[PDB]
Amino acid sequence: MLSGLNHLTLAVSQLAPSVAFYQQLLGMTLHARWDSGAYLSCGDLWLCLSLDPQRRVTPPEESDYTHYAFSISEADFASFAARLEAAGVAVWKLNRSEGASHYFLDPDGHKLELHVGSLAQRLAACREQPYKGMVFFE
Amino acid sequence: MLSGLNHLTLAVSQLAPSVAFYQQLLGMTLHARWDSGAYLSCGDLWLCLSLDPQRRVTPPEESDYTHYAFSISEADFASFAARLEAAGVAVWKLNRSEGASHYFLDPDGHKLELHVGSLAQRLAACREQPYKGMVFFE
Numbered sequence A, B: 001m002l003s004g005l006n007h008l009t010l011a012v013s014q015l016a017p018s019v020a021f022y023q024q025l026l027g028m029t030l031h032a033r034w035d036s037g038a039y040l041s042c043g044d045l046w047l048c049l050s051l052d053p054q055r056r057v058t059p060p061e062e063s064d065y066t067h068y069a070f071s072i073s074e075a076d077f078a079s080f081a082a083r084l085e086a087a088g089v090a091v092w093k094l095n096r097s098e099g100a101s102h103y104f105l106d107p108d109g110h111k112l113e114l115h116v117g118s119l120a121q122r123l124a125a126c127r128e129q130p131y132k133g134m135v136f137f138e
Ligand SMILES: O=c1[nH]n2cc(-c3n[nH]cc3[N+](=O)[O-])cnc2c1Br
Pocket: A007, A009, A036, A037, A048, A050, B131
């Protein structure tokens, strides 16, 4: 029925710092901006920043595990993490899963992630060392 | 340089109803499931449902505008939106103007959307009727 993710929309408290975070720091392409939002792209990903007066800057301990992971090469992983570290971007988790992951927060506390690895690679690793109670479906 | 969305991870309060929602109702492909999570795919989208004791069933007034939109064809949009409402899936936003979108909630209150149209098509429509203060970047 569904063919993929059409877009991701993030509620932001301040449009300008969020645009700066995703365009200048993360390198996404800014396509349009208006008084209450912005459209950016990251590969095939359509990202909408939506100005929301209800959005507070949320500490990572006060939000659940819902998060959004962006693909990055193994070759770029270390330097991109250092770039984030130089900018003072907070880390909310340390990786314990297959593939390289860097868990960082956006200006409003949206939980983000850089990840090296596909679903196929994760499934193959899990076949070798399954999670508790793991069942596979073909 | 980030190349796209690697995966979307949703914190869920009850794994079984969430897996049933995304696999059975939304038709996504179930690849694996374990005691604390599940992996599904929707086209290129890698979806992880993660069992989280911190996740609450959240009414729509209690969360901000952050939401996740899935692509659907023009031919399938109307019948599937009717199927979701007939199945009792809650709607968290109704905009008559936005005929190509259907806003619905998952079992935990994650805000979802069916949308027909790409970013390029949205930009073209926006040039014809811009949002207030809109600026485009070629
Ligand atoms: O997910 C989305 N929400 N949204 C709101 C707007 C918006 N901002 N101001 C008014 C509107 N609107 O027309 O819904 C524009 N685009 C989007 C997307 Br894509």
